[PDB]
Design an enzyme around this catalytic site. Structure first.
Site, PDB file in Angstrom:
ATOM      1  N   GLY A   1       2.380  -4.761   6.676  1.00 50.69           N
ATOM      2  CA  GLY A   1       3.437  -5.336   7.457  1.00 50.69           C
ATOM      3  C   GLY A   1       2.717  -6.019   8.604  1.00 50.69           C
ATOM      4  O   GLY A   1       3.101  -5.850   9.761  1.00 50.69           O
ATOM      5  N   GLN A   2       1.697  -6.787   8.256  1.00 46.80           N
ATOM      6  CA  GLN A   2       1.025  -7.581   9.250  1.00 46.80           C
ATOM      7  C   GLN A   2       2.221  -8.469   9.532  1.00 46.80           C
ATOM      8  O   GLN A   2       2.669  -9.209   8.653  1.00 46.80           O
TER       9      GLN A   2
END
Lengths: 159, 101
Positions: free
Chosen positions: A53-54
């Site tokens: 979940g960059q």
């Protein structure tokens, strides 16, 4: 088939992944630099894609995605909040076209004791135990714990 | 009994011994053998606690290998194949910032 593991930013999505290939795990940073390995299970070889979940990761997941047909959508059953924000989103994301091409074998993690989140609760929160649509699968786990090991590989076989 | 490593934060005494056993004992429980950590191949020569993460610790044996463990692994998380001799000892890097042994 191109198979996507999505889930959190800072999850250590990866943790899980390499826990998974490699047994011993990896930093609870998820990926952040492009991650694919292809796995034979049942000798169809799926390249399983770990995306952190960059924040940017989420955005770019959205960006690039075509060529998918199946996915382990990872979610935290202890994350109550960006679980929420997400929920909507992802849900719909899924409802954006191509993800309808794919069964969501969702992984519910951090299910582990004196605190996690109530399977039933989240199921009904998404109405999402739903079969208003697709081959789905629901699987319990604190994948970070590793929880459902053959069952995944196998149940997923089902088709 | 070769080595003790201690959790400071948390009331613990960790021990490694040549029995090819690592036992944890809890002093507040009044020396309970709270848990036993096993995944040996030889005498346990040394234990050091990564005190940094007290919580996680590393083990050295002369069968040349090192197991680093997680509590949720009364076994290491993994073993790595260190020595070409034996791993006598394991030690930590003073800084919290980076990490060396």
């Amino acid at each position: 088939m191109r198979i996507l593991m999505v889930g959190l930013d800072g999850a250590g999505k990866t943790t899980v992944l390499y826990k998974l290939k490699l047994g011993e795990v990896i930093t609870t940073i998820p990926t952040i630099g492009f991650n694919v390995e292809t796995v034979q299970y049942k000798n169809i070889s799926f390249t399983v894609w770990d995306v952190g979940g960059q924040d940017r990761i989420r955005s770019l997941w959205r960006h690039y995605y075509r060529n998918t047909e199946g996915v382990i959508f990872v979610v935290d059953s202890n994350d109550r909040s960006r679980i929420g924000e997400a929920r909507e989103v992802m849900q719909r994301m899924l409802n954006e076209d191509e993800l309808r091409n794919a069964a969501w074998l969702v992984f519910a993690n951090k299910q582990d004791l004196p605190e996690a989140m109530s399977a039933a609760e989240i199921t009904e929160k998404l109405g999402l135990h739903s079969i208003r649509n697709r081959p789905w699968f629901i699987q319990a786990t604190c994948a970070t714990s590793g929880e459902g090991l053959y069952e995944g590989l196998e149940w997923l076989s089902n088709s | 009994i070769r080595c003790i490593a201690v959790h400071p934060t948390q009331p613990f005494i960790l021990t490694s011994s040549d029995d090819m056993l690592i036992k944890l004992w809890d002093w507040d429980k009044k020396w309970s053998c709270s848990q036993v950590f096993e995944g040996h191949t030889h005498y346990v020569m040394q234990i050091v606690i990564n005190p940094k993460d007290n919580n996680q610790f590393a083990s050295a044996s002369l069968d040349r290998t090192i197991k680093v463990w997680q509590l949720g692994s009364s076994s290491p998380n993994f073993t790595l194949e260190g020595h070409e001799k034996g791993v006598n000892c394991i030690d930590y890097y003073s800084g919290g910032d980076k990490p060396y042994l």
